[PDB]
Amino acid sequence: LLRCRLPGGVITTKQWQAIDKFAGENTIYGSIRLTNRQTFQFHGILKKNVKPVHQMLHSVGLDALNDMNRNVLCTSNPYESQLHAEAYEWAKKISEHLLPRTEPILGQTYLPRKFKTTVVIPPQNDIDLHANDMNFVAIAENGKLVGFNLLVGGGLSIEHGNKKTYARTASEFGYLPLEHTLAVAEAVVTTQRDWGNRTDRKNAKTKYTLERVGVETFKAEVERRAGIKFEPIRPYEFTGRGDRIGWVKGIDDNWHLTLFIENGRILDYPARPLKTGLLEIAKIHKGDFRITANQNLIIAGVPESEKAKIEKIAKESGLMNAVTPQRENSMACVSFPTCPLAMAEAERFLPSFIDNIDNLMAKHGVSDEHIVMRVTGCPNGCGRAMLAEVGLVGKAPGRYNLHLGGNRIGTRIPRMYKENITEPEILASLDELIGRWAKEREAGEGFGDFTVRAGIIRPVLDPARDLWD
């Protein structure tokens, strides 16, 4: 397995052509796997190719640079298209500022655990901020960014039956002018580095450090170290976490074509040459591609005149095959056969599972609707099921824990509803549950909120204390 450092998921067509080639020739699987952290992975690199892979990444200006700072995410397709550039420039700066000097920031012993950061452009939460340690929520005025609201402490990983572990959402620290960004970023990393419990790795994460010392205590140290005082949180709202599948207008005569790629797995399948179609678009595309946090790919900045050009290839290659709004809002992790920590299938199970969910949605007359549904192959939480309305957490081969209760924007953790059950048992529950939502839901009420309001599942109000029954 090889993964790239790709801030904000922006990758050029030239770099793309380089990855399509290597993946095709130098890997067992021969596929490109877009991750939900806006980057790519190769699966099955032969040890002889471990050298040419780094060279290949480098020749195109890429790198794979662990208990370090992971890919810094950034909202991929904002409604106010102009805001992307400075947000993306900031995600890129934070990423570079947090890189190891090989360690004034990381420390010699580095970090207790992996540190995850994001730049969010409301009203979109496609990057799923509550799954991350440090979050920069962009505040704009007159089309220019002016500062960031800082949310710290997100994390989703749990351990089966271990009430000492839990998923936690990020806490609000305050508003910081744009100039204090790197200082604040640096301060959060260092206090976590110092305060973070290093002995027990399962308790090293920031979400744990925050619960032990307290948000306000953590906050004061961040202000002390940063040389600033946080200002009050400035109003921000989210409306969803999905991608804008299809064409959307960008700035000027620019357009963006977000392609839905199931499981982010790019490979040529019989009659659906996804991998070649993307190579073909890469060769004629004026611009970049953007890897979304929903494992999809955006063909960004297509001049209005080139729309038909690109659409012809995407269409012919099966890259624009129509899916239901449900499939578009469902996610799973890689899991088998490559993940060594896998307990239950995820990526290889999602497709057929969703076929089943689509039938249920149809059967209840809600086929134009969607439920944020995610399947994670083990509790480490890579598929982000702990921020979904319906989350399936793998417990053993063919058995998952069923969580319900999250919401569409992902600001609530789903409590466990049923435990260690199989697919036919999972579907029987959802058949009934969807049946009720379809008939009892209020105007525009999501499935998650319904289960909570209808007394179907108690909400998780304070993860550290009431996540576990």
* Shortest separation between residue 309's beta carbon and ligand SRM, angstroms: 30
- Please identify, using beta-carbon distances, which residue of 90 and 115 lies nearer to ligand SRM: 115
Q: Is 74 marked as binding a ligand?
A: no
Contact 133, 116 (CB under 8 A): yes
Residue written as token pair 């007159």: 142
- Please identify, using beta-carbon distances, which residue of 247 and 468 lies nearer to ligand SRM: 468
* Shortest separation between residue 455's beta carbon and ligand SRM, angstroms: 29
Task: Give the binding range for ligand SRM (CB under 6 A) out of 7-15, 140-148, 154-162, 267-275.
Answer: 154-162
Please give the residue ranges that form the binding site for Na ion (CB under 5 A): 261, 264, 295-296
Residue written as token pair 């140290």: 221
- List CB contacts of 175: < 8 A, sequence separation 6 or more: 139, 147, 148, 149, 150, 230, 231, 232, 233, 234
Residue of this chain nearest to ligand SRM (CB atom): 157
User: Burial of 17 by CB count in 10 Å (0-12 exposed, 13-18 middle, 19+ buried)?
Assistant: middle
How many whole angstroms separate alpha carbon 438 and alpha carbon 373? 16
Please give the residue ranges that form the binding site for ligand SF4 (CB under 6 A): 333-335, 339, 341-342, 346, 376-378, 380-383
Side-chain-side CA neighbours of 98 within 13 Å: the count stands at 32
Site string for ligand SRM, 62-101 (x = CB under 6 A): --------xx------------------------------
Which one of the listed residues 113, 378, 395, 399 is annotated catalytic? Answer: 378
Rg value, the chain, Cα: 21
For 297, phi and psi rounded to 5 degrees? -130, 130
Query: Does the footprint of ligand SRM cover residue 404 (CB under 6 A)?
Result: no
Number of H helices, E strands in the chain: 13, 21
- Please identify, using beta-carbon distances, which residue of 419 and 466 lies nearer to ligand SF4: 419
Task: Determine if the peptide bond prior to 337 is cis (ω within 30°).
Answer: yes
Task: Give the binding range for ligand SRM (CB under 6 A) out of 211-219, 267-275, 278-286, 376-384.
Answer: 376-384
333 an active-site residue? yes
4 an active-site residue? no
* Shortest separation between residue 295's beta carbon and Na ion, angstroms: 4
How many whole angstroms separate alpha carbon 398 and alpha carbon 423? 7
339 an active-site residue? yes
Task: Give the binding range for ligand SRM (CB under 6 A) out of 176-184, 185-193, 218-226, 330-338.
Answer: 330-338
Residue 88 tokens, joined: 């993306």
Q: Is 378 marked as binding a ligand?
A: yes
Query: At how many degrees (to 10) do helices 50-59 and 13-26 cross?
Result: 170
Task: Give the binding range for ligand SRM (CB under 6 A) out of 15-23, 269-277, 378-386, 422-430.
Answer: 378-386
Q: Looking at 75, 149, 157, 451, which residue binds ligand SRM (CB under 6 A)? A: 157
Q: Is 333 marked as binding a ligand?
A: yes
Distances, alpha carbon 155 to alpha carbons 109, 262, 282, 380, 387, in Å: 21, 25, 35, 10, 10
- Please identify, using beta-carbon distances, which residue of 129 and 378 lies nearer to ligand SF4: 378
User: What residues are paired with 399 via a beta bridge?
Assistant: 396
Contact 263, 332 (CB under 8 A): yes
Number of Cβ within 10 Å of residue 320's Cβ equals 18
48 an active-site residue? no
- Residue numbers at the binding site for ligand SRM (CB under 6 A): 1, 3, 35-37, 39, 41, 43, 70-71, 113-114, 116, 128, 131, 155-157, 205, 295, 333-334, 338-341, 380-382, 384
Q: Which residues are known binding-site members for siroheme? A: 382
Task: List residues with catalytic annotation.
Answer: 3, 70, 114, 116, 333, 339, 378, 382
